[PDB]
């Protein structure tokens, strides 16, 4: 038996994510779907509207076999590091394939571009050279080099988000040396975006988005809103970011991952007079910082992650551990087969390992749950250490916990 990897934030799990998990198998030919998922803070820098334990329960019912956490180390990063770490994880798990979405059903222009950029990298990087000399910025210089080779209309659209993610997936397998086959199909009960679906529940109104949500999801959601009493938004953390930037020194704020040299001063001026995450971000955005990148930096400023430590962990060539959130009986079976071949530990309960990348995952949790009104917060906190992998039986509805 053979495995198809999916890189997913599942924010939340909806019918579209279903179209992914089912097409993957049919198109690749693998009877096993393994997803590596961003746990509590995602690639664009925002918190998951629900815990990674809940979203696991949803995915395990909707056709994913193994749910592995994408360590925070790799998860809050722009696409290439995100892809590098997530593709390493799928590599560790011997997935025969990688199934990623774009607005194209075709895996070809991802391929053709990759080599082109793979082979021209010298020409390219020598072409970035010449341009800085003319006094242009680096993004300028980079844009000028790309366009010489890449203005041939291939045409890979490096705008459409998930295509960028596709390119870096294909990229990472290529410089990785992984025996992995990238697949893909076109994105599209017509299906809704995860975004618009989020606004729904955020408006307290989860009823709008139901037909777009698989059944298992709605309950687990309703159960999560019933269990812990909120849905999680970025504005839930503003109060704690405001504490963070209060209790730090501009020398200390310089060392937080993604705070570039000099910005820490602008950072502190803005936060004092910022009455919302919205306003704060409004005072923050620069030419040097995209919207999303600020959400990333702000999340780091939330977990108080230092550059040096982050540099330490990125230097590792492979995922430090395999963090097991959940599994079906196929998942369990696929795992126990390959487990002996896993070269890094397999974490199910947190007492089975100690690594700096994992405290980071645990810390992210302890921060993530802050919005839950006490005592309800503390019950939640028992989960990271408490919650053992969630086990579903595809012979319907058996959770064994």
Ligand X SMILES: Nc1ncnc2c1ncn2[C@@H]1O[C@H](COP(=O)(O)OP(=O)(O)OP(=O)(O)O)[C@@H](O)[C@H]1O
For helices 356-368 and 376-386, angle between their N-to-C axes, nearest 10 degrees: 160
The reply on whether position 292 binds ligand X by CB under 6 A is no
The maximal CA–CA distance of the chain, rounded, in angstroms, is 65
Cβ(334)–Cβ(66) under 8 Å? yes
102 binds, among ligand X, a second copy, none (CB under 5 to 8 A by kind): ligand X
Phi-psi region of 301 (alpha: psi -120 to 50; beta: other; left: phi over 0): alpha
What's the CA gap between 173 and 166, in Å, rounded?
A: 11
**Bridge partner list, 6:** 35
156 binds, among ligand X, a second copy, none (CB under 5 to 8 A by kind): none
Residue nearest to ligand X (CB): 101
Q: CB 163 → ligand X: shortest distance, Å?
A: 9
The reply on whether position 110 binds ligand X by CB under 6 A is no
**Cβ-based nearer residue to a second copy, 169 or 257:** 257
Q: CB atoms < 10 A from the CB of 120, how many?
A: 17
Cβ(300)–Cβ(256) under 8 Å? yes
**Cβ-based nearer residue to a second copy, 95 or 256:** 256
What's the CA gap between 47 and 202, in Å, rounded?
A: 13
What's the CA gap between 317 and 237, in Å, rounded?
A: 32
Out of 86, 88, 91, 102, point to the residue binding ligand X (CB under 6 A).
102
What's the CA gap between 85 and 38, in Å, rounded?
A: 11
Burial of 168 (0-12, 13-18, 19+ CB in 10 A): buried
Quote the tokens at residue 298.
């702000």
Q: CB 300 → a second copy: shortest distance, Å?
A: 11
The reply on whether position 140 binds ligand X by CB under 6 A is no
- For 47, phi then psi, to 5°, come to -80, 150
Q: Can you give the binding site for a second copy, defined by CB under 8 A?
A: 238-240, 242-244, 246-248, 272-276, 302-304, 363, 366-367, 370, 374-375, 377-379, 381
275 binds, among ligand X, a second copy, none (CB under 5 to 8 A by kind): a second copy
**Bridge partner list, 326:** 67, 390
Kindly determine how many residues on this chain lie close enough to bind ligand X according to the rule CB under 6 A: 20
Out of 128, 140, 146, 162, point to the residue binding ligand X (CB under 6 A).
162
100 binds, among a second copy, ligand X, none (CB under 5 to 8 A by kind): ligand X
Binders of ligand X in range 13-52 (CB under 6 A): 16-17, 19-20
Out of 187, 219, 304, 366, point to the residue binding ligand X (CB under 6 A).
187
Out of 3, 4, 8, 30, point to the residue binding ligand X (CB under 6 A).
8
Binding site for ligand X (CB under 6 A): 6, 8-11, 16-17, 19-20, 100-102, 161-162, 187-188, 191, 193-195
């Amino acid at each position: 038996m053979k495995a198809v990897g999916l890189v997913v934030e599942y924010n939340p799990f909806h019918n579209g994510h279903l179209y992914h998990a089912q097409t993957a198998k049919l198109q690749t030919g693998c009877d096993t779907a393994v997803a590596v998922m961003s746990g509590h803070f995602l690639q664009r820098g925002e918190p998951a509207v629900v815990s990674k334990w809940a979203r696991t329960k949803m995915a395990l019912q909707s056709g994913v076999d193994l749910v592995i956490e994408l360590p925070y180390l790799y998860a809050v990063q722009k696409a290439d590091i995100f892809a590098r770490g997530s593709v390493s994880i799928l590599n560790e798990l011997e997935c025969e394939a990688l199934f990623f979405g774009s607005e194209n059903g075709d895996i070809k222009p991802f391929l053709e571009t990759a080599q082109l950029i793979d082979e021209h990298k010298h020409i390219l990087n020598d072409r970035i050279k010449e341009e800085l000399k003319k006094g242009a910025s680096y993004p300028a210089a980079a844009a000028i080099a790309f366009s010489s080779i890449l203005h041939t209309e291939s045409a890979l659209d490096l705008s459409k988000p998930n295509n960028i993610l596709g390119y870096q997936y294909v990229t990472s397998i290529l410089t990785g040396g992984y025996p992995m086959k990238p697949y893909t199909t076109a994105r599209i009960n017509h299906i809704a975006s995860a975004t618009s679906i989020r606004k729904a529940m955020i408006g307290q109104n989860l009823e709008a988005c139901l037909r777009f949500l698989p059944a298992a999801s709605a309950r687990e959601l309703a159960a999560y809103r019933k269990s812990f009493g909120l849905w999680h938004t970025p504005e839930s953390y503003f109060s704690y970011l405001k504490y963070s930037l209060s209790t730090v020194t501009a020398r200390e704020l310089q060392q937080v991952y993604e705070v570039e040299e000099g910005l820490e001063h602008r950072i502190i001026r803005s936060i004092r007079k910022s009455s919302s995450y919205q306003e704060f971000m409004e005072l923050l955005k620069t030419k040097r910082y995209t919207w999303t990148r600020l959400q990333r930096m702000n999340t780091h400023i939330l977990t108080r992650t230092k550059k040096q430590d982050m540099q330490k962990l990125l230097d590792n060539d492979k995922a430090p551990y395999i963090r097991l959130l959940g599994m079906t009986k196929k998942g369990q079976a696929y795992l126990s087969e390959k487990k002996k071949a896993l070269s890094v530990p397999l974490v199910s309960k947190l007492s089975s390992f100690s690594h700096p990348a994992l405290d980071l995952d645990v810390k992210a949790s302890r921060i993530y749950s802050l919005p839950i009104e006490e005592p309800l917060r503390t019950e939640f906190d028992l989960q990271e250490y408490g919650h053992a992998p969630i086990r579903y039986d595809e012979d319907e509805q058996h959770f064994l916990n």
